[PDB]
Structures are given as C-alpha cells and as structure tokens.
C-alpha cells in the first residue's frame, strides 16, 4: 500500500495504483477523474509514495486548489517526515503598479478596483496579487508584461510579498512557476531534475506555458514612461516608438489574423530602431519602475525580432490600446525540455480526453513523447450523471450571431428561468451573443440578469451570482470564457448538505464551443491536423462546460439544456457532442 492510500476514495484506487506504478517506471501517466471524486487525496498519496522512495517530488497545481492540496498532504504522517513546501516564485504574482495602469488604460473597473483594494485573494502570509485572480478579472490580461519580475523595486507590495513568502521533499508550485522554470532551464528555485512530477488540473498546464513564452510590447505605458525621463536620449526613443506605431498601422492594414515576421517586414526596421533607442537612454537616475518597463519592452521587441515567434498587431483601427504580441506556436521544444528533466509524471484533471479515452489532443498539447504516454482509463462514477435532466428543448434557429437567433434563444432561456429552482448559468461563445441575449432578456429578467462583458469580468459575475442566489433570487448569468471552464459553482454554505445545493440548478449551453481557442499553439495544430483538431478542441471545451453542473456526489435537481440546433439536426460532424450527451437520461 501507499502512504495515505487509506485516505483515498475506493473508486480512485485502481487509477492511483496504475499511476504510481507507471510513474515509477518512467511514464507520463494520463489520469482523468471526475470532479468530486477526491483527486486531491490521490495526488497526496502519489507524492507521498514518490518522496518516500527518495525521489524529488513536485506538484504543479493552480493556487486555487492548492490550499486543499496542502490540507490533504499535511494529514499523511510520511509527508510530515520528508517535508512539504511551496515555491511561491515571482511568476505567481502581478505588478500592482503596471496592472493598475493597465486596468485604467483599458477601462476595466473590476481589475482596477481589485488592485486598489490591495489585490486581496478572490479564492503563512496572505497571498495577494495572484496572477490567477487577475486572469479571472481580465481573461485577456497580458500576463507577460504585468508579471512581477526581479527587476521590480522592493517597495512594490507584490515584491515584498514574494520576499516574505520566500520562507523540501515534496515541493508544490503553480503551472506558471513550472513553465517559467522550464524556460529558465533552457537558455544557453526548483529541482534541476524532477524525479516525480504530479500536475493537478493538467488541462491548464499548456495555457500556462504559452503565457510564459509570450512577449508583449505595450506602447502607451512605455511612451508615458519615457516622457517622464531626462532629455538625454528621450527624443530618439519617442520618435522610434512613434515610427513603430505608424508601421503597425501600415502592417495591420497590409492584410486583414496571427501573421509572422516575414509577412510584415516593415516592422523590422521599426523594432530594431526601437530596441536601439531603448538601450541608449542612460540608466543613471532611473527608478527601477522605468528600468523594469524599458527592459521588459526591449525583451518583447527582441522576441518579436526573433523570427521564431508569431505576431499580433493591435492598433488604432481596431484596438485603442496599441500592442505587439509575439508568442510561440511551437512549445514542442519547451515541453520536450521539460519532460527530459522529468523521471516520471502523473497528469490529473477532470478533463484530459476528448470523446473517449482519446488523449491524442492533450498529448499533442503538452508534447508528451509518444513512447512515454500512459493513458489510464478515466474514472467517472454514476453520480456525475444520475441527478441530471437533459431536456429536449432547444433553439430552432441555428446560432449565427443574428437578431433572429437571439429572439428565439432568449425565449427558450426565458422558459428555463421560469422553471428554475435556483441559479441559471447560460454559457455563450462570444460577447456579441451575450449582448444580443441580454438585449432580449433585459426587461423581463430584471435584477435577475447578470451580463458578463468586457466591463463585467467572470469573477465579478461569479460574486454576483453567489450574492443574488444567497438573497433568494434565481439569478441568470449570461457567461463566457472562464465560465465554461473555471468557476466552481457549488454552494459553500452547504458543505455537508449537497442535497440542498441549488447554486446552479439549470445549465444552458447555447452553442457548440467551436472556436473558443485562439492561441497560437491551437492555430498551428489546426494548420497540421485540420478539422480533427478543430472538432476535438470543440468537444474538449464542451465536456469542460458540461463539467460545471455536478461538482460533488449527492446533489439533486440539476437540469441540462443544449439549445444548439445542430445538436438535433442530424449533421454528421456533430456526432461527438451527442455521444457525450448520450451519457444522460433525456
């Protein structure tokens, strides 16, 4: 037996046994278990067994689920022997100054108010300024430019937090920490070699790598920084940034899209001049604020100049906030560098596969060597589907971003709000759909409707959903983005009475989530694999969206609605999404 195997639920013991075995054998184990099965105890036992063997063990997991992970591990007597610590590196926090400035710059009152409130945690010392919270507040946050770096002045609150939090057999870190560690490891805090790696919520890991390997040149705060400097080299740098912005206008007009360097050679002169000038103004007498701003800007411009990254131009015709994104479409090299510094690994997530035991997509995303992948059978008990009603109602008009489609879909959603026992989460695939559905549902569902938009984040909507449900209303949340994948809609006021959990009683998927992924990795994956990758990403996102209904066993009165007309229209390409839905009693 394994340390803490008695704490693990019986339904996970075969998964745990195979995972421990194959991980000790040097395999990258794929372990998918339904949310609410006690996966934290399984991970605790895996890490305890590995560290008991003398292995360096690292558990990479988001800080949202890290409190309970430490709680599950601190109960194992052998874990209390070999040591447990948290490597709360700088890739975990944001820069309060830069993040504030960004929030006012882009009119995000939620993010601005959270930064002004002290960055206190939405979910030793109290952890604040977390990157994951800011991402829940700005799904499109440019983490790269706002992450707390070692070049930040020590009077920064997040910098002081990192230094204080820098307070050993089992090391626990976040996905972003592990990605940044991989990056710094490959160049010419954490173990240089990972004997045993365990990744909770592995489906997020790839998104953490792409974020770490993305560079972001934001022109407005950079120019505003240089304006408040000495006149030594100010005029050339400002002229060069102006030339870069003009060239960005020209290059975005050149073709109307994630395009490479060779498609926009006009920026090449521009960025080289920019870097040159950003290195020519004297460091003598710059506060480390401006030092960070300018060095981050030079790094971003050089990564753009690399020719190995792909660029996004966001300029005046389309985006009031000028910005140059340069990300990698090929984290192949990065994640192989990771796995080569790893003896064995267990990837744990509620959603690892797409339409089956099929872990092809996820193995491609994390670039696991095919000779090390070990696909275990997924564990989904009966209670994930037993208290669920899959209703037969749906919108006849196909989802086409039209006024007519909104007019019909909103009637169906109105009926759902009419028969709902508690809250209702209506998942959407774009802000345009949210705005149309809000236009039709506003007057009737008043003081019940929550409209998630570019000005109302997923987490402010989450807090409001919880609040209006606590007040006895049956709130109806038109949500998107993290609402598909991130939110945990289980009533924390009823930890021991799941039969009374009515926080989310009716989930309504408006559209098949085709096209929710816009990352460079997925774009290249499509350019290689085709509609296979498109459909598999859709099915994966769809299973994630379904995973918001039943978060623990013993719940009752959960209703599921799928309004997409193509689901019931007899088209062949919608074949996977029906299979998943056939796991219910309609």
Residue numbers in the entry: 107 to 229, 240 to 283, 288 to 308, 325 to 392, 396 to 725
From the article:
CasDinG is an ATP-dependent 5′-3′ DNA helicase essential for bacterial Type IV-A1 CRISPR associated immunity. To provide immunity against plasmids, it is proposed that type IV-A systems bind DNA with an RNA-guided multi-protein Csf complex, and then recruit an accessory helicase called CasDinG to the DNA. It is supposed that, once loaded onto Csf-complex-bound DNA, CasDinG uses its ATP-dependent 5′-3′ helicase activity to silence transcription of nearby genes, mediating immunity. CasDinG contains an essential N-terminal domain predicted to bind DNA.
